[PDB]
Design a binder for these strands. Structure first.
Ligand code: TRP
Ligand code: K
Ligand code: K
Ligand code: K
Ligand code: K
Ligand code: K
Ligand code: K
Ligand code: K
Ligand code: K
Ligand code: K
Ligand code: MG
Ligand code: MG
Ligand code: MG
Ligand code: MG
Ligand code: MG
Ligand code: MG
Ligand code: MG
Ligand code: MG
Ligand code: MG
Ligand code: MG
Ligand code: MG
Ligand code: MG
Ligand code: MG
Ligand code: MG
Ligand code: MG
Ligand code: MG
Ligand code: MG
Ligand code: MG
Ligand code: MG
Ligand code: MG
Ligand code: MG
Ligand code: MG
Ligand code: MG
Ligand code: MG
Ligand code: MG
Ligand code: MG
Ligand code: MG
Ligand code: MG
Ligand code: MG
Ligand code: MG
Lengths: 56, 117, 150, 110, 17, 142
RNA sequence: CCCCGGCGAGGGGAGUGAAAAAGAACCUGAAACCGUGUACGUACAAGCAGUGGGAGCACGCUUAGGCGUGUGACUGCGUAC
RNA sequence: ACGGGGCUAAACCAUGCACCGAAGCUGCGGCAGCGACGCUUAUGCGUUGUUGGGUAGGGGAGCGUUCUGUAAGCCUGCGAAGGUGUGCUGUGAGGCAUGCUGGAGGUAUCAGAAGUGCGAAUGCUGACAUAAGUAACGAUAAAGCGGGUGAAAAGCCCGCU
């Protein structure tokens, strides 16, 4: 099956009305490093919830 | 003598797409669809210059009919009374007085009732 | 047009408009439909129509004061500075000189003036009698065109 | 003072980069840099390098302050596409388009 | 290129004898 | 000079109350469709809603002639296959009496976004009581 | 030459030049097609999408007003070549 | 199985007077064709009568494009052609002026010659869309982890499974 008429540029933008990305809103601060991270994730420096968890 | 069609064909296409401003979709961008929609818009404009005269007389008659019944007479008897009283005011002006000067319209109704009685 | 007579693709089955030659005038790089050849653009003019039109042109040069008749018109040496000074002596700027029989000094002296053409009575043509503003004829030449035009 | 940075002939479609560019339009450079850090998109790596270059251009060539810059304009244009050939079944050939983009980020404190 | 096989196939193509 | 046109922001609409006791259904509906549309005013404009608000009381006591009380049938289709449904005039009065007058007037009004805005100005009640006393309806004797 | 970037690609300055939106993907740089911004409309509404009428809004004028431009609620007629 | 609502007339028969109703007819302004008569033409004007839907097709009159002559002329770096807007103008094909871009050509008038006008031909060539960020990513023999390098490592190197 294939189209009988060429859909318009308006019908193409209506279908993509739901394709938008949603930014993350929750950047939390570590209480000893002051670094930002995702919640329930370790920091880039290897801290999590105040303590150094990975010595990397 | 070889003739190139670049400059002449561009100016004739650009003339049709200037008359197709405001149309939807390909009707204002694509020449094959714009040309064909500019012709239909001129067929409608020719036909509606005749219909504009019908739709306004149909509007004047309905406003005379409403203002005449406020004075206790129909349209078909108000017009007959004015012809009997040799009044030659057309329907464009009657419908204009019916709205803007309601006491001049009542004088005309009394003149039409006197000619019928 | 250079190429083959091979049919580009078969007649039926391919879902494409039919073709028989890559040389067809519809195609890019194809032939010209009505391609030209060298042709001869010459026309015929009757003798009495050619001589009747020179008499019409010559009569207008005298009516419009564009014909000048002298008895002698020559220069002493084949120098372009001599002729240009001589035509300044007569207020002639853009002129056609018709002589009885061409002398070589006058022909070399006018070769570089692009508004002066020097001609003998036999080699006149209808277009140059109209193209130049003034025409200067020696009366050696005025009587030579009369017998030429009967 | 308005400052521009561009990435021309970036290897990805313009429709994929436009999803990430719509996240940071009108934001502060402080806030646009961490939105791009935690977006899991290949286009978020291309857009963050054009945004970091526009901040360095504004500080160095224009003497601006990082603290007050905002992303006033950002738009993605289409670039030339590269034509490749992909073999299909029964000897048919398809044409592959490898689309590129032109990313333009504009920062200004006003 | 060669045509689609279903356009060649006598059973599919010659359906209305 | 261009013909006067009524502007929807400065048009004055009034309130009336009509008693539908003993009226003929069709001959009452036509006068309602005139005043909802505004055909009784000299400022009548075909693309503006210049009509009036009308409150109809005692919708369950409207009258019909002949054998129309048992023979007039109302049809509608539900959208589902086989779903044609009917109801006589006596059953519509017993179950939902206001719908009898609303169906009649709706068929006499223009079709489109403007004819649906004219219909919003009709208020049909099955009894003798309305609660629009704040609007001060004037009695319209037919 | 300086700056961001991977001692990248790409870009912003500086400089050359009459011109760099003449920067090597280089004279001019149309259309289809794809975007960013602004004004108006659009989530109770049915169809060749215009045409005739027409409110409101925005921006210009110029006035003791109502013209110009853009948009086009609502409404009559209207089944492409 | 009235176009619908609805109708006991808003149905049917008979009589009568009003009104609505078309691009028909009339009124006002304008253009053109064909006759007839003339302020007199010199082939144009004035008065009057009438005509002006149109396919196949016949007849008449024109617009614009490239090239040759007029043109060693005329316009043009104080901005040509081309591109893009705006205004004015003709019954039409069209014309004129000008803002911005462009950066070196253009061409009156009257004649002359045509590769002289494109939406169609499942037309030809190039560019760009749509379906759509959809199907698919090529044997169902299979991977896991630690270390190294690196801007970045599921896929590279080393090691053990
Ligand atoms: N249908 C089969 C066999 C096939 C090949 N060529 C054909 C031509 C006609 C009919 C069938 C075929 C295939 O596609 O492999
Ligand atoms: K060959
Ligand atoms: K330039
Ligand atoms: K370009
Ligand atoms: K373009
Ligand atoms: K409409
Ligand atoms: K120009
Ligand atoms: K075609
Ligand atoms: K797509
Ligand atoms: K696999
Ligand atoms: Mg086919
Ligand atoms: Mg050739
Ligand atoms: Mg001979
Ligand atoms: Mg020479
Ligand atoms: Mg395959
Ligand atoms: Mg193979
Ligand atoms: Mg420079
Ligand atoms: Mg040059
Ligand atoms: Mg260029
Ligand atoms: Mg709404
Ligand atoms: Mg509803
Ligand atoms: Mg339709
Ligand atoms: Mg009917
Ligand atoms: Mg009449
Ligand atoms: Mg009429
Ligand atoms: Mg008529
Ligand atoms: Mg007529
Ligand atoms: Mg005709
Ligand atoms: Mg020439
Ligand atoms: Mg030209
Ligand atoms: Mg200009
Ligand atoms: Mg041709
Ligand atoms: Mg074409
Ligand atoms: Mg055709
Ligand atoms: Mg190409
Ligand atoms: Mg799908
Ligand atoms: Mg799927
Ligand atoms: Mg899949
Ligand atoms: Mg594989
Ligand atoms: Mg590993």
């Amino acid at each position: 099956a294939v189209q009988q008429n060429k859909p318009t540029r308006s019908k193409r933008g209506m279908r993509r009305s739901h394709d938008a990305l949603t930014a993350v809103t929750s950047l939390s601060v570590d209480k000893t490093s002051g670094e930002k991270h995702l919640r329930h994730h370790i920091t880039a420096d290897g801290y999590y919830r105040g303590r150094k968890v990975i010595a990397k | 003598a070889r003739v190139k069609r670049g400059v002449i064909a561009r100016a004739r296409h650009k003339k049709i797409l200037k008359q197709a401003k405001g149309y939807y979709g390909a009707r204002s961008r694509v020449y094959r669809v714009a040309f064909q929609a500019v012709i239909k818009a001129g067929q409608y404009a020719y036909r509606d210059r005749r219909q504009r005269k019908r739709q306004f007389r149909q509007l004047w008659i309905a406003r005379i009919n409403a203002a005449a019944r406020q004075n206790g007479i129909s349209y078909s008897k108000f017009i007959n009374g004015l012809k009997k009283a040799s009044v030659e005011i057309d329907r464009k002006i009657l419908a204009d007085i019916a709205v803007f000067d309601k006491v001049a319209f009542t004088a005309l109704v009394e003149k039409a009732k006197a000619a019928l009685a | 047009v250079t190429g083959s007579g091979k049919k580009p693709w078969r007649q039926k089955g391919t879902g494409r408009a039919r073709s028989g030659s890559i040389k067809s005038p519809i195609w890019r790089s194809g032939g010209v439909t009505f391609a030209a050849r060298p042709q001869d653009h010459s026309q015929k003019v009757n003798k009495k129509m050619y001589r009747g039109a020179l008499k019409s042109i010559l009569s207008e040069l005298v009516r419009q004061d564009r014909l000048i008749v002298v008895e002698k018109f020559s220069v002493e040496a084949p120098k372009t500075k001599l002729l240009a000074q001589k035509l300044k002596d007569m207020a002639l700027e853009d002129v056609l000189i018709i002589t009885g029989e061409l002398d070589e000094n006058l022909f070399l002296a006018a070769r570089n003036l692009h508004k002066v053409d020097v001609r003998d009575a036999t080699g006149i043509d209808p277009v140059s009698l109209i193209a130049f503003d003034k025409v200067v004829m020696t009366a050696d030449a005025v009587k030579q065109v009369e017998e030429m035009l009967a | 003072m308005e400052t521009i940075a561009k990435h021309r002939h970036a290897r990805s479609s313009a429709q994929k980069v436009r999803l990430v560019a719509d996240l940071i339009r009108g934001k502060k450079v402080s806030q646009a840099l961490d939105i791009l850090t935690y977006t899991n998109k290949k286009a978020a790596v291309l857009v963050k390098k054009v945004l970091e270059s526009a901040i360095a251009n504004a500080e160095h060539n224009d003497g601006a302050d990082i603290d007050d810059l905002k992303v006033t304009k950002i738009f993605v244009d289409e670039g030339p596409s590269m034509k490749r050939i992909m073999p299909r079944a029964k000897g048919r050939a398809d044409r592959i388009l490898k689309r590129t983009s032109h990313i333009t980020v504009v920062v200004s404190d006003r | 290129v060669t045509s689609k096989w279903f356009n060649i196939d006598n059973k599919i193509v010659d359906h209305f004898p | 000079m261009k013909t006067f046109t009524a502007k929807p922001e400065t048009v004055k609409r009034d309130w009336y109350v009509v008693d539908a006791t003993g009226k003929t259904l069709g001959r009452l509906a036509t006068e309602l469709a005139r005043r909802l549309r505004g055909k009784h005013k000299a400022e009548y404009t075909p693309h503006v809603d210049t009509g009036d608000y009308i409150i109809v009381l005692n919708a369950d006591k409207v009258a019909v002639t002949g054998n129309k009380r048992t023979d007039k049938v109302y049809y509608h289709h539900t959208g589902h296959i086989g779903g044609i449904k009917q109801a006589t005039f006596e059953e519509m009065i017993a179950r939902r009496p206001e719908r009898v007058i609303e169906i009649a007037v709706k068929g006499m009004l223009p079709k489109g976004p403007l004819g649906r805005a004219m219909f919003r100005k009709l208020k049909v009640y099955a009894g003798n009581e309305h609660n629009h006393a704040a609007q001060q309806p004037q009695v319209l004797d037919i």
